[PDB]
């Protein structure tokens, strides 16, 4: 989380690593639990929600063939309806929160297309290829 989101997206592309480090869990020095009766259940819920959000993002990653990479390039072409902004307008004038706010309404269809396309290409075509 060390990265500053006030920098342009091309600047946070370098800082992705520390943010991906803090996502999994805190840096080492995990928590001693005396298991208070009728207490600590909120703590178990907190840990479960942490692993739940991590797993949601890793589910999206694994469905996209990027299960091992932080940056992965996809064969999905960009819809101009999503944004007519250029490369130097996005990566040099916008910040990550701004861009995600602009793309939020289409993010769902983007996820669905990205999962369908990246999966079909790497499964059906590669299957038919090694078939011969």
């Amino acid at each position: 989380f060390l990265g500053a989101a006030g920098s342009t997206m091309g600047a946070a592309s370098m800082t992705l690593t520390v943010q991906a480090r803090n996502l999994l869990s805190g840096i080492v020095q995990q928590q001693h639990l005396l298991q208070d009766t009728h207490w600590g259940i909120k703590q178990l819920q907190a840990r479960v929600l942490a692993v739940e959000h991590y797993l949601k993002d890793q589910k999206f990653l694994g469905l996209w063939g990027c299960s091992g990479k932080i940056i992965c390039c996809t064969a999905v072409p960009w819809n101009s309806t999503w944004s007519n902004k250029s490369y130097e307008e996005i990566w040099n004038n916008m910040t990550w929160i701004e861009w995600e706010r602009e793309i939020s309404n289409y993010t769902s269809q983007i996820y669905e297309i990205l999962t369908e396309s990246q999966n079909q290409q790497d499964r059906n075509e590669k299957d038919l290829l090694e078939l011969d």
Binding site: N84, K85, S86, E88, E89
Partner: protein
């Protein structure tokens, strides 16, 4: 110090071209050339900032190019709203902007 074509004319649906050239230290090699539509007595407008790159919202009928001794601004599918004065500038990432002598597109 940056000189352009004195004046130029066109017609409907055509494509008028304007030049922008100067000495080696002003307009040569790879110094970025920008093109502004600047109606006289009003506010300017960024038409083309990088040599081959436009401003957002600009109609795609505007194009730019840069040779080794002159940069060219082309306006295709001419419409009555293009009848203004156009100006060019030479700049780098830290060097200041050096405007041009302007060119009035007639029709």
């Amino acid at each position: 110090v940056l000189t352009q074509s004195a004046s130029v004319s066109g017609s409907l649906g055509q494509s008028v071209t304007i030049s922008c050239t100067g000495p080696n230290s002003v307009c040569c090699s790879h110094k970025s050339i920008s093109w502004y539509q600047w109606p006289p007595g009003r506010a300017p407008t960024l038409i083309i900032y990088e040599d081959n790159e436009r401003a957002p919202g600009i109609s795609p009928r505007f194009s730019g190019y840069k040779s080794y001794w002159s940069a060219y601004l082309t306006i295709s599918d001419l419409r009555p709203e293009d009848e203004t004065t156009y100006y060019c500038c030479s700049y780098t990432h830290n060097s200041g902007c050096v405007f041009g002598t302007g060119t009035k597109v007639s029709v």
